Paper text:
Among these is CYP126A1, a P450 with ∼35% amino acid identity to the cholesterol-oxidizing M. tuberculosis CYP142A1 and CYP125A1. However, CYP126A1 is highly conserved across pathogenic and non-pathogenic Mycobacterium species, suggesting an important evolutionary role for the protein. The CYP126A1 structures reveal a dynamic molecule, with the BC and FG regions clearly affected by ligand binding.
The CYP126A1 Kd for ketoconazole is 0.34 ± 0.07 μm, whereas imidazole binds substantially more weakly (Kd = 2.59 ± 0.06 mm). For example, ketoconazole induces a Soret shift from 418.5 to 423.5 nm at apparent saturation, in addition to inducing smaller absorbance changes in the heme α- and β-band peaks (minor shifts to ∼569.5 and 540.5 nm, respectively, with notably decreased intensity of the α-band). However, ketoconazole binds in a different manner and extends from the heme in an orthogonal direction to the other two molecules. The distinctive binding mode for ketoconazole has ramifications for the structural organization of CYP126A1. The crystal structure of CYP126A1 in complex with the azole drug ketoconazole revealed that a large scale reorientation of the BC-loop region has occurred in response to ligand binding, disrupting the putative dimer interface observed in the imidazole-bound form. Furthermore, the N-terminal region of the I-helix and the associated FG-helices display comparatively more modest reorientations as a consequence of ligand binding. The ketoconazole dichlorobenzene moiety occupies the region previously filled by Leu-249, whereas the extended tail of the molecule displaces the BC-loop residues Val-84 and Leu-85, resulting in their forming hydrophobic contacts with the FG-helices. Ketoconazole binding reorients the BC-loop region of CYP126A1 and disrupts the dimer interface, resulting in a binding mode for ketoconazole that is approximately orthogonal to those for HTS compounds 1 and 7, which extend upward from the heme, close to the path followed by the I-helix. The formation of ligand-protein complexes at substoichiometric ligand/protein ratios for ketoconazole and compounds 1, 3, and 7 indicates strong gas phase binding.
Numbering used by the authors: 6 to 74, 80 to 178, 193 to 414
The structure:
């Protein structure tokens, strides 16, 4: 069973989150030492955590399970190793998280909502009914990218040009373009503050020596990482949502008939899709997790993607149900690092599906979904659909 399963082998992730591997994991060893293979980061083994109770226990103890432990086009050769908020512990984490939260202003969130609703309408009004198209390419990717650019204060004219560097053309040039751009943007917001999250965070000076404000290079890292990954997780929830609804047409009809069902439906979409299905932590001290001793310094990987289908907590865990109650999913994390984007993601999903379902009661997926090759993101690269009134 587990002894021949390699969770670092991305071939196991190329076709979607491998739920069947995680059923084995939960049954055989909730908490398991995963020896390093040819495919494993740093040739370092780790504790792999697949059940809900133990995953939640790790998330809820940031003192024992430290978040101090980048792909894409992110610059790999900066002179200094910056931190990003999700890799911080207290005291610095608390101060920076509070700062980022203070950047999520009501006026800016209204701007996102208005822009989303306009764009969602524009895009859906442009669909040719019944004609196949790639939902990811034409709609799902666009809306969160615009949201994340509004949040980070990126002028509209620069957004797709930036998205090309974030998601390509070579890695060096991409990263260099983004670093220059980010640093110009930061400089501009310091000279003329704007009502956006990046401006608030960039303009901060903190007097605690153990909790300094973000450096310029750290602000670039934050910009790049959140742009890429906040856009990606959100689009994956949208695309995976459409797919789940298309595979359960009776629920689609129920939902489209009563938008008061949408908030609960959105929680089930996040549970089902679990776009960010794994996290790293490092044990800071000897401790036991589910009766397994762990030593200080050892890596821990929790799998929310597995926890969210744990049959000890979710009845009929392997079925999608838009009316699921209760639904204590971990799709947005839990504890001190809980997703600061959770309401933003849910807004994206709510507006898109309201606009989509108002117009189309028939959703057909006409080619197999193509999944991205990753165990850090569960995502759909292409989803070819036909939308009709129905
Ligand atoms: C459906 C889309 C999204 C999903 C599934 C998701 C998931 C998550 C999860 C599971 C965590 C916890 C990380 C950890 O425990 O180490 C997290 C953290 C975070 N999320 Fe998201 N996220 C989504 C969208 C967004 C968006 C749109 C934003 C933009 C504000 C955002 C901003 C953040 C930030 C800043 C953190 C780190 C918080 C901290 O470390 O204190 N996320 N997200
Ligand atoms: C060896 C092994 O088995 N494995 C390798 C390493 N593995 C892994 C590595 C990194 C990782 O990263 C998740 C954390 C970091 O990523 C985000 C994604 N995100 C973005 C917005 N909301 C969530 C994030 C949050 C805030 C900000 Cl500022 C920026 C980001 Cl990138 O959460 C998740 C998993 C898991 C699989």
């Amino acid at each position: 069973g587990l002894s021949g399963i390699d969770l670092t082998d991305l071939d196991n992730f190329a076709d979607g989150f491998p739920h069947h591997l995680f059923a084995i994991h939960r049954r055989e060893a909730p908490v398991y030492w995963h020896r390093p293979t040819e495919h494993t980061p740093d040739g370092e083994g780790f504790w792999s955590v697949a059940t809900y109770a133990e995953t939640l226990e790790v998330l809820r103890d940031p003192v024992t399970y430290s978040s101090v432990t980048f792909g894409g086009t992110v610059l790999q050769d900066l002179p200094v190793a910056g931190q990003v908020l999700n890799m911080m512990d207290d005291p610095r984490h608390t101060r920076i998280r509070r700062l980022v939260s203070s950047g999520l202003t009501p006026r800016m969130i209204r701007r996102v909502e208005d822009d989303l609703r306009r764009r969602a309408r524009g895009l859906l009004d442009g669909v040719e009914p019944g004609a196949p198209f790639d939902f990811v390419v034409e709609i799902a990717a666009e809306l969160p990218m615009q949201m994340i650019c509004i949040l980070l204060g990126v002028p509209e004219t620069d957004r797709h040009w930036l998205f090309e560097a974030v998601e390509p053309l070579n890695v060096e040039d991409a990263g260099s373009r983004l670093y220059t751009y980010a640093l110009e943007l930061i400089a501009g917001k310091r000279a003329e503050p704007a009502d956006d999250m990046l401006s608030v965070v960039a303009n901060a000076t903190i007097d605690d020596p153990d909790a300094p404000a973000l450096s310029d290079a750290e602000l670039y890292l934050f910009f790049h990482l959140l742009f890429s990954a906040g856009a990606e997780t959100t689009r994956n929830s949208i695309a995976g949502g459409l797919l789940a609804l298309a595979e359960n047409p009776d629920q689609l009809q129920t939902l489209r008939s009563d938008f008061e069902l949408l908030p609960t439906a959105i929680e089930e979409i996040v549970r089902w899709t679990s776009p960010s299905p794994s996290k790293r932590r490092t044990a800071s001290r000897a401790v036991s997790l589910g009766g397994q001793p762990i030593e200080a310094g050892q890596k821990v990987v929790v799998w929310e993607g597995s926890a969210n289908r744990d049959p000890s907590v979710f009845d009929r865990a392997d079925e999608f149900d838009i009316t699921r109650k209760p639904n204590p999913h971990l799709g947005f994390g839990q504890g001190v690092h809980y997703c600061l984007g959770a309401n933003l993601a849910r807004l994206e999903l709510r507006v898109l599906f309201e606009e989509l379902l108002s117009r189309f009661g028939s959703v057909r997926v006409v080619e197999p979904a193509e999944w991205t090759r990753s165990n850090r993101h569960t995502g759909i690269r292409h989803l070819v659909v036909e939308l009709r009134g129905g």
